Amino acid sequence: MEENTRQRTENYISAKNQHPAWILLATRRAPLVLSCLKTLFEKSHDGIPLEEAIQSLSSILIEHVSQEQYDINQDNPFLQASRELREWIKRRLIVERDGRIFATDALEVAITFVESLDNRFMTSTASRLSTVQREIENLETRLNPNPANRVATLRRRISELERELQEAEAGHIEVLETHQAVEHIRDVYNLASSLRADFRRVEDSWREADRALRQSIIGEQYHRGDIVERLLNDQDALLNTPEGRVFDSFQQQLRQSSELKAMSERLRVILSHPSASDALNRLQRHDLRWLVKRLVDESQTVLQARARSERDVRGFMKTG
Amino acid sequence: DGRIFATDALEVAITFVESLDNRFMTSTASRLSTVQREIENLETRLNPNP
Amino acid sequence: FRRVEDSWREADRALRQSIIGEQYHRGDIVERLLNDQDALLNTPEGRVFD
Amino acid sequence: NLEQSLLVAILRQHFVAWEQESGTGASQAQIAIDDLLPQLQIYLGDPGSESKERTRLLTLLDQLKGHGLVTSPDAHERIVIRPIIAHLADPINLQALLAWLREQIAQQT
């Protein structure tokens, strides 16, 4: 339907007037706010203890004493940090949970835009043209069920790999030249770092589903009519198709601890190569080194959040 | 050459608005599998030991 | 694709400004011309794109 | 006009190059239009539209044709720099122009 374009214009207007990310980027102080928030959240592994956050933010504000044009006062950076954290929590681009602060989806999107402005890693690269080639080659073998095609693909790939093994036995192996290694490391960092992107959004989706369920229950003057449809099954009431099931499938891969065991060693081995000194700066090296543990910890936090919500909504369809 | 184009500044701006609400999820099983293959290919290419 | 063009054009402008500034030096230009490589060696983008 | 004088200087530079490489007898002191657009991009800025800058360059070339220093573009988008340019911008006049321009810059300071 062509009216979907006008509906899209309306959606853009609504996002301009209501989305925290776009709201922030339009203000006059956006550069300072984004720089401070990035400096705060850059080093961290999992959230920030609130008291720890105040000290770091006050120290950063002190780093910006020369920036007096933004009312950065010298009298008391602690009070200024305390005020700023509530200012940003009210804009729901940082949230308070379990005694620690996190960055919501809006702040993540804003920072990704700002730091992709100028010096972003190149995506149009030979490495990604090989990556998509491999992935598209793999997908077809799994999309069609014909056995002859599958056996032909396997028995030709076996020949390719056998020829390559015979060549490697003769000693014709070759390693990446420095610039190819740099480019490949950059591409692999770009891929890996994107796994962490959507954790802050699964929680929003689950909270949205919970609120919708409660609104539906309360909005019917006689709850018993609908509570039957919900309580007839023992499975989780937070049946969020859009993102919950994708995250569940992602978990179904994370729990294969053998792959993680291999990855933990492989990443540090990769970072040991001399070229990794130049391809990635120190911060990126840190992020890529601990990524394996960070994904697992974040997944545990998200799973705990779902467990809490499901338990506390099951404690609500009952007694209703 | 008589044909308009979108400079990089517009490409980034459009990528921002379209990533606000309905962007494809990257935290997926497929991406986490893809990184395995890519890491393995990089490892098999960095070390020189035959 | 739209950023490689901008990088190359920026390198071109920088090269022309350097040529104009060097009112009294022929060595740099003769060095550039004798080179078989393209004059616009924008390493960060050009080589990756190539 | 000053902006015309900038193009006059560029044309004179190409003219001295061509004359020193060919000898004064030859009559084809030509230049291609596309070779001037990059030259003017450094000074007059980049409008991000080939049509706008081409219109600017052609307007300048026409205004110079009014003075007789250049012919209009031919079929191959090539112009002939009339030899009168060698007498318009010669050392006696270039020195005066430089003296005027240095005073203008000093005033700008």
DSSP labels for chain A? -THHHHHHHHHHHHHHHH-HHHHHHHSTTHHHHHHHHHHHHHS-SS-EEHHHHHHHHHHHHHHTTT-GGGT--SS-HHHHHHHHHHHHHHTTSEEEETTEEEE-HHHHHHHHHHHHSSSPPP-SSHHHHHHHHHHHHHHHHHH---HHHHHHHHHHHHHHHHHHHHHHHTT---PPPHHHHHHHHHHHHHHHHTGGGGHHHHHHHHHHHHHHHHHHHHTSS-THHHHHHHHT--S-S---HHHHHHHHHHHHHHT-HHHHHHHHHHHHHHHHSTTHHHHS-HHHHHHHHSHHHHHHHHHHHHHHHHHHHHHHHHHHHTT-
C20 → chain D, closest CA residue: D42
Question: Which secondary structure element, helix H or strand E, spans residue C36, and what is its range?
Answer: none
Report the DSSP pairing between strands D30-32 and A48-49. Answer: unpaired
> Can you say whether residue A222 is alpha, beta or left, with left for phi > 0 and alpha for psi between -120 and 50 degrees?
beta
Radius of gyration of chain A (CA): 25
CA angle D85, D4, D45 (to 5 degrees): 130
* CB under 8 A, 24+ apart: contacts of A71-80: A78/A54
Q: Which residues of D touch B9 (CB under 8 A)?
A: none
If we measure between CA atoms, which residue out of A203, A223, A163 comes closest to residue A310?
A: A203
Selecting from A11, A171, A249 the residue whose C-beta is nearest the C-beta of B50 gives A171
Residues of A with CB under 8 A from a CB of C: 122, 124-126, 179, 183
Q: Kindly tell me the sign of the dihedral angle through the C-alpha atoms of A292, A294, A295, A299.
A: positive
CA angle A171, A173, A179 (to 5 degrees): 150
Return the bridge partners of D79, or none.
D31
Q: What SS3 class is residue D107?
A: helix
> Rounded distance, CA B36 to CA B42, Å?
10
Report the DSSP pairing between strands A100-103 and A48-49. Answer: antiparallel
3-state helix, strand, coil in chain D (%, to 5): 70, 5, 25
Q: Which amino acid is at A86?
A: R
C47 → chain A, closest CA residue: A179
Interface contact D45, partner C, CB < 8 A: no
- For A37, A76, A82, A86, A223, the CA distances from A58, given in Å and listed in that order, are 12, 9, 8, 14, 50
* Angle at which helices A50-63 and A77-90 cross, to 10°: 110
Cβ–Cβ below 8 Å for D38 and C16: yes
Residue with tokens 């796994």: A195
Interface contact C32, partner D, CB < 8 A: no
Return the bridge partners of A101, or none.
A48, A96
Q: Which chains border C (3 or more CB–CB pairs < 8 Å)?
A: A, B, D
Contact in structure between A46 and A297 (CB atoms under 8 Å): yes
Residue with tokens 């019917």: A220
> Rounded distance, CA C2 to CA C24, Å?
36
Return the bridge partners of A15, or none.
none
Cβ–Cβ below 8 Å for A179 and C47: yes
If we measure between CA atoms, which residue out of D39, D10, D15, D12 comes closest to residue D28?
A: D15
Residues 6+ apart with CB under 8 A from A48: A40, A41, A56, A100, A101, A102
How would you write D6-23 as a 3-class SS string? HHHHHHHHHHHHHHHHHC
Contact in structure between A259 and B36 (CB atoms under 8 Å): yes
Residues 6+ apart with CB under 8 A from A277: none
> Rounded distance, CA A29 to CA D90, Å?
56
If we measure between CA atoms, which residue out of A284, A302, A300, A94 comes closest to residue A193?
A: A284
- For A19, A26, B3, the CA distances from D54, given in Å and listed in that order, are 43, 36, 15
Min Cα–Cα distance to chain D from B2, Å? 7
D/A touch flag: 3 or more CB pairs below 8 Å: no
> Rounded distance, CA A80 to CA A86, Å?
10
Interface contact C6, partner D, CB < 8 A: no
CA angle C24, C30, C36 (to 5 degrees): 155
Residue with tokens 């060095």: C31
Interface contact C20, partner D, CB < 8 A: yes
Say what the alpha-carbon torsion angle D25, D30, D35, D41 is, to the nearest 10 degrees: 90
> Rounded distance, CA D9 to CA D12, Å?
5
Selecting from A124, A126, A179 the residue whose C-beta is nearest the C-beta of C1 gives A124
> Rounded distance, CA A294 to CA A46, Å?
7
Cβ–Cβ below 8 Å for C6 and B11: no
* CB under 8 A, 24+ apart: contacts of A301-305: A301/A46, A302/A199, A302/A202, A302/A203, A302/A247, A303/A251, A305/A203, A305/A206
Q: Which chains border A (3 or more CB–CB pairs < 8 Å)?
A: B, C
> Rounded distance, CA A213 to CA A105, Å?
23
Q: Name the experiment that determined this structure.
A: cryo-EM
- For A186, A206, A277, A289, A301, the CA distances from A200, given in Å and listed in that order, are 24, 11, 31, 21, 11
Q: Kindly tell me the sign of the dihedral angle through the C-alpha atoms of C36, C42, C44, C46.
A: negative
Q: What SS3 class is residue B9?
A: helix
C/D touch flag: 3 or more CB pairs below 8 Å: yes
Q: Which amino acid is at C36?
A: D
